Structure 1
Amino acid sequence: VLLLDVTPLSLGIETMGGVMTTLIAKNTTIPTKHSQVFSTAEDNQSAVTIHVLQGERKRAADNKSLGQFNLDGINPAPRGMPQIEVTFDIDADGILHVSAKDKNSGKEQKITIKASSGLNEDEIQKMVRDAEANAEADRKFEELVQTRNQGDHLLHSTRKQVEEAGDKLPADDKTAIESALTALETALKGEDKAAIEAKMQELAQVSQKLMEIAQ
């Protein structure tokens, strides 16, 4: 009513492409507890690395790591089919606990983090500086990851749909499509956003008839 225990910085986890996904925002009143559900990046994925982050940067790395833990015994499934519920819990004492629960297996793994963990009152204010100071640089970073993943999806889902079709697809088309996948898979390895969209364009155009069959 006169004071207010708050979070000076955003708390969350590294997600695919080295982006920080925030779970609990900046200047949040403790106690607080938010959850959010995630999944796997490669098919037949058996574990996920929860890597805990503090700070206002979009790149995972430009932020302060607080810890890191795996949840395994993920029963084999298609990618992005598991339900990994990551929960952040801060009590009256300032202590952050972070679980991940496989909603199938029913397994669980928590890390507890002392209120004294992560950046001191000075670094907090630098973090906020370097955030405002690199708003755009990270704006460019975010939309590239989004493109990397938007790309990375399109690749996987096409390779599926090509197996799914088989005989049904003109060899004519399956050549034009198999080349445009190879090119897009290379584009993904670089950092050139344009190029990724360029090969996603090429795929889109030569894939007209593949789409039809899947539908």
Structure 2
Amino acid sequence: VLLLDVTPLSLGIETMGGVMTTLIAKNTTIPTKHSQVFSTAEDNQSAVTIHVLQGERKRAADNKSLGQFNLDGINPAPRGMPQIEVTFDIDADGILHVSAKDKNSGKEQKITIKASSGLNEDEIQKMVRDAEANAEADRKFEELVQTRNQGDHLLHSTRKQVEEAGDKLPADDKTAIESALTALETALKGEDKAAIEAKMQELAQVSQKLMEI
């Protein structure tokens, strides 16, 4: 064949930290479908939002929003336990169907996005040029977000351990840990990955007794 229909930009959803995660790649032939299971980042999250995006940039905020919906009623469970399957399906007429279904509860929600939605030819070209001009920056953004999300987890899991060690943790250890958590919490708000990693390292160095238990 010498011509065919494709979807002209990547399609996906916003994930933790403001990132666009791709479910269908740019220039994929239509019709097409793809699913991916996602979970929750923190304990006891019972409601989630699926924000649908078109584009090639790593910051969700720089892509074209196509719509959104929420999924409610998920049993409050530990971080990473919910299994929420997200399915993008584009039919032969360019209509995009997005669904999310929580496997434990069977709760489901969906949206239909019409084929004329999203960016036009000129904005499509501009998007691809902008993503190429910002490729290094977007890579660095994705690496910062991966570090931030790790560091966020380390703060939470450390505070939980401090709480449950209680008395068994010497005062001087708890003082050192408390001060390292503060520093890490500060570094996470900035945009220097190595500063965050350095603060994780300083926290591990004062945490050894806390992980003896």
TM-score, with length taken from structure 2: 0.94
Q: Which runs of 4+ in 1 moved over 3 A?
A: none
**CA distance in structure 2 between the partners assigned to 1:18 and 1:123 by the alignment:** 22
Runs of 5+ consecutive residues of structure 2 not aligned to the other structure = none
Alpha-carbon offset, residue 25 of structure 1: 0.6
SS at match of 2:62: coil
Deviations 1:141-183 (A, max 9, x none): 1111111111111111222222333333222222211221122
Deviations 1:96-126 (A, max 9, x none): 1111101111100101011111001111111
**CA distance in structure 1 between the partners assigned to 2:158 and 2:134 by the alignment:** 36
Deviations 1:57-93 (A, max 9, x none): 0000111110011101121112222111111011111
Out of 39-48 and 163-172, give the one that drifted further.
163-172
Alpha-carbon offset, residue 36 of structure 1: 0.7
Alpha-carbon offset, residue 130 of structure 1: 0.4
2:144 aligned partner:
144
**CA distance in structure 2 between the partners assigned to 1:78 and 1:162 by the alignment:** 18
Out of 92-101 and 162-171, give the one that drifted further.
162-171
The residue correspondences of 1:78-117 to structure 2 (distance < 5 A) are 78-117=78-117
Out of 77-86 and 156-165, give the one that drifted further.
156-165
SS at match of 1:153: helix
**CA distance in structure 2 between the partners assigned to 1:102 and 1:20 by the alignment:** 21
Alpha-carbon offset, residue 192 of structure 1: 3.2
1:195 aligned partner:
195
Count, aligned residues? 213
1:206 corresponds to 2:206: yes
Out of 73-82 and 130-139, give the one that drifted further.
73-82
Runs of 5+ consecutive residues of structure 1 not aligned to the other structure = none
TM-score, with length taken from structure 1: 0.94
SS at match of 2:76: coil
Alpha-carbon offset, residue 22 of structure 1: 0.4
SS at match of 1:212: coil
SS at match of 1:209: coil
**CA distance in structure 2 between the partners assigned to 1:108 and 1:137 by the alignment:** 36
2:55 aligned partner:
55
Out of 158-167 and 46-55, give the one that drifted further.
158-167
**CA distance in structure 2 between the partners assigned to 1:150 and 1:2 by the alignment:** 47
Deviations 1:2-57 (A, max 9, x none): 32111211100000111100011111111111111111233221211100000010
Alpha-carbon offset, residue 195 of structure 1: 2.5
Identity %: 100
**CA distance in structure 2 between the partners assigned to 1:126 and 1:80 by the alignment:** 37
Alpha-carbon offset, residue 191 of structure 1: 2.7
**CA distance in structure 2 between the partners assigned to 1:181 and 1:207 by the alignment:** 10
